[PDB]
Write a protein that binds this ligand. Sequence first.
Ligand SMILES: [Ca+2]
Ligand SMILES: [Ca+2]
Ligand SMILES: [Ca+2]
Length: 321
Amino acid sequence: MDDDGTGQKQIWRIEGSNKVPVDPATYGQFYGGDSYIILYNYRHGGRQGQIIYNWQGAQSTQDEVAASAILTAQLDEELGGTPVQSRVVQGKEPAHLMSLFGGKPMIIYKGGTSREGGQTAPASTRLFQVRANSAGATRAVEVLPKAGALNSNDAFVLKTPSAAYLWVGTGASEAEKTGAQELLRVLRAQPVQVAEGSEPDGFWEALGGKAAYRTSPRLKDKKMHPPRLFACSNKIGRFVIEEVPGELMQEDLATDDVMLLDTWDQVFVWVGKDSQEEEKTEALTSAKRYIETDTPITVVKQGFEPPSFVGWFLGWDDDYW
Ligand SMILES: [Ca+2]
Ligand SMILES: [Ca+2]
Ligand SMILES: [Ca+2]
């Protein structure tokens, strides 16, 4: 999409059965627990156009997904059936959508709203994982503030009532460091700059104590064969393996299948709890063959993943399943 993302946009959040305007001063910040509709009006190549992006946060509920479908059909009809329509799940945003925020990162908070609970309040201590893709599109995703949530490949922002830290993994890019700084501007906090390996005591204390975290030779590498994830299933009646594009999200791990994560110097074979034995056997055979055409093969089970695996994902919830 050659359009530059600087057209007029309106953003609404699904709240119950309605779409509700988002504060225009916070465009670019979204709750991961919610669904949104973005109406983007632009002009490119001498012609006007409109796109509706329907963005589904990773923790948004089925009720909100269904509500969004009604709301977008309504909007579509209101506009006379003119917009291009695009459905996007968190982590799978196209470059064009990432460009709508003036070069700022997409910031994804924990929580959101629901019919029952209303708007959740922010935690007093917060941790965000800041990751950029190869193209430079940057996401700052809120996670639980524990030492184990860190990964060497990315930048992190840690905000507490009394302090703020910008932790920079050895593998973190300048886009990630910049994105972390933009997040800190939104949080209205001035950071202590912390490099991986020289953390001050206050940093670990703020996280509830020092602990091992998500690291490996490849996670620590700054240069970047960037890791590829594959879904392995025999559900269609024969065994096949296909790639999972976009940012690597925990939801991409199919609990009824086997997943291959190739980090180049290692291939993980992740076994879903409801996957059949044959899917593991064939995934192991396929992985060995991939490797041999041109390296550890590490088997991991759902719910028992090692930090070296979990570090490649953008956010991880220990109680996801
Ligand atoms: Ca919600
Ligand atoms: Ca990174
Ligand atoms: Ca299966």
